[PDB]
Amino acid sequence: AEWDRLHPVHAGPIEPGQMREPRGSDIAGTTSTLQEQIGWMTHNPPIPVGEIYKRWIILGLNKIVRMYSPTSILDIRQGPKEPFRDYVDRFYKTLRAEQASQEVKNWMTETLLVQNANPDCKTILKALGPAATLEEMMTACQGVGGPGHKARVL
Amino acid sequence: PIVQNLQGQMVHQAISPRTLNAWVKVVEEKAFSPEVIPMFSALSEGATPQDLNTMLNTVGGHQAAMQMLKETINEEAAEWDRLHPVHAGPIEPGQMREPRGSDIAGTTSTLQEQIGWMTHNPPIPVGEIYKRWIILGLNKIVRMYSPTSILDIRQGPKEPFRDYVDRFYKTLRAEQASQEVKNWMTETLLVQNANPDCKTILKALGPAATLEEMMTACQGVGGPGHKARVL
Amino acid sequence: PIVQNLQGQMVHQAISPRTLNAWVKVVEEKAFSPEVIPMFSALSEGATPQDLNTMLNTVGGHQAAMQMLKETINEEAAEWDRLHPVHAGPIEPGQMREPRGSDIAGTTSTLQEQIGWMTHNPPIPVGEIYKRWIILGLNKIVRMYSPTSILDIRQGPKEPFRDYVDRFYKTLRAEQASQEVKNWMTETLLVQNANPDCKTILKALGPAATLEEMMTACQGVGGPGHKARVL
Amino acid sequence: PIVQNLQGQMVHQAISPRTLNAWVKVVEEKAFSPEVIPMFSALSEGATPQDLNTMLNTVGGHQAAMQMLKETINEEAAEWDRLHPVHAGPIEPGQMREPRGSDIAGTTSTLQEQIGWMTHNPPIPVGEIYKRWIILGLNKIVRMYSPTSILDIRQGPKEPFRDYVDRFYKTLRAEQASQEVKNWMTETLLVQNANPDCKTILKALGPAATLEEMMTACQGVGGPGHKARVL
Amino acid sequence: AEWDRLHPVHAGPIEPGQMREPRGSDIAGTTSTLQEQIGWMTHNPPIPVGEIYKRWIILGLNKIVRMYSPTSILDIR
Questions:
Q1: Which of E14, E54, E45, E20 is nearest to E35 (CA)?
Q2: Do E72 and A135 touch (CB under 8 A)?
Q3: What do we know about how this protein assembles, alone or with others (chain E) (predicted)?
Q4: Residue of A84, A88, A133, A142 for testing the chain E interface, max E β-carbons within 10 Å
Q5: Residue E60 with chain A: CB contacts under 8 Å
Q6: Most B CBs within 10 Å: which of C26, C27, C67, C138, as the mutation test of the B interface?
Q7: Gaps in chain C (C–N > 2.5 Å) come after which residues?
Q8: How many Cβ atoms sit within 10 Å of the Cβ of residue B58?
């Protein structure tokens, strides 16, 4: 659809030494033939109908991941005996396709990662914060859940 | 501070006792709020560094807000000096010395020495640059003494969208951030703290969503956010 | 603002705290009252584009109104870039450049370029156009915030015709419907709310009757005192 | 007060009883406190000795604090003569005379002699020195009537950390110590007398953490309806 | 940044040659295409953009492996 409004197509007869021009249906493969498609790929310059259609599909797949997710970044809380490996991995898997910039990430590390942590963990994260690295933070607060992965009841 | 007069004339003259007493009352009412920033910007353009020291002391009539301005300007003075090292000695008339961070704040310079850097061609505008450090600290007091918290604005069960908005962006204005983090805040924080109705409509709207639709959202329930006072 | 409108004067004067503070409080007293718009224009006389933004930002209440108003003003400037070709002629020997929508807004322009146009012969009027964009961009919001109606107007148990016409007119001004709309409403509603002795005048001379014999009509009802404020 | 310049071709212009009431109202509202000093420090800028003395004796109120304040001015004017013998009659011919302790204080000097020393070349800063002496007085009174002592105070159970530094720093400010000693009492004595929920987070944040993020402690601690809540 | 420390380079082709020298950003696939990447690899002497990139992902994953799940070797008896 959007392609169609971006690029009008002459429908009338085509000259010799030329190929017809693609529509948004033709790029999607719907209203064109296989010999046209090989035509378009054998074009000079190349007319790369397959790269555009693929890009659309890659685009539409990242719509599904965000639409089929009720989960807010904001109100993600640690369970009763949670260790930092489950929690860090989990807050960051909610952001897959949102594609957060770094300056956002620094802001989230300061506030919500700290405040939704359980109380022993929260002191470690408060302490190293976004001034330190994530390598620092991971190993330090992994210290309250220990080698068995279990943190003292709340 | 300096005042423009006719026929190419500008004069450093003392801050009138009237100007002052009216300014003093504005500091008392508005220092801990967004409101004082465009007035400090309009006011402090004609402040020299010697004058901006006198205004900064005045603004910090509060000994917590006084500390933040004070601590920031000495850190900005340093930050300046550590970014541009300049040896900065005395020199004879006709020419000028390079200013350090301590000279731009004016503690180690005379007033005529500051006014020189400013009235020279090309200018060094020691006032604009020391205003900037001062302004940096001001944004901080506004952020501290903010009664509202952006994390804390959650719409309540009879509240319309327009009233929730009106309070969300006052909060957002008192919070200190760059544009990216603000768009985080309007995209993520404003929507996911909202009522289920509101939330549904603004996601199914897609790119067709407007601030006009946002001023009509979640209505029908009475009280604040449905009308405004005319007469 | 500029000091004077005299030809080719590049003389600029700053905005007092007090003038910025006194604007905040018109909005705090009575913000959507129709008295405030052309009051606002009066207090922003001699203004530049820069003076305009300083005055819009100082205000810290009504932030949903203020922000939509901010955006709308940037949309006028993008309308002017689309609508007008800027610099369609050839290069003119001796002439100051022509303003783009963005130079009127202030996004591509210095104070001395802005003033130059306002003090040019004949004067190219960028502050008034920037002001225009706020006057038209404000009014469209005040149409939307305002559920003012003329049709539901209150009348008492011993109501003379004197203050009713004033009440009519002020409520009608507070309404922002179409002139036609207002005339069809004013034609039907003002006559039908009249008692017999008031009614006679406007049956005969119609909706356009002199207000001298309307305001003295339905005397001796046992109304409140003199229309004068001498107490 | 002096107007038009700060240096050279400066002139008198007089202060009104309407604006003397502006001055005295600040002392009358805020009493003997560090608040009045930044207002009065910006007041006494561009002042003739004869203005300062008109300011000084229009407050009224409290005679023995007024007399104690003049004891301070007496010791410092008598100190100026002690340290620095003047020459008898004219020191140089285009100067009026070399000024004595009393001549700075205003007691023996007419307004022509006061401006006459200020428009000498280089300037002699007669009401700068006299502003410096009245300022010694106000800080000595400020201490003498102080109810809070720097080694007594601690944090309240219902007091945020921001309220706590404002208070600590007020008690510090009303007190006199070397800078070196005032750095111990801000490092150690401020930290030691804090409420524990502030003192635990400070050690774990550590020294390179910013004042911005260490100043938001002990929040909510007074109960719901608290003013401090930012992070 | 460690590559960059050791190897300052021009932004484009060098003025008499016909190809550029790879940055840190060129190693990582961030600012580089496949044609420039097999041009560094087909170069003589070979400039080892994919080998040395792989070395980083090995080094990095090695950091991770040693930081994820500590084993207690005091319970081995």
A1: E20
A2: no
A3: Interacts with host NUP98.
A4: A142
A5: none
A6: C67
A7: none
A8: 19
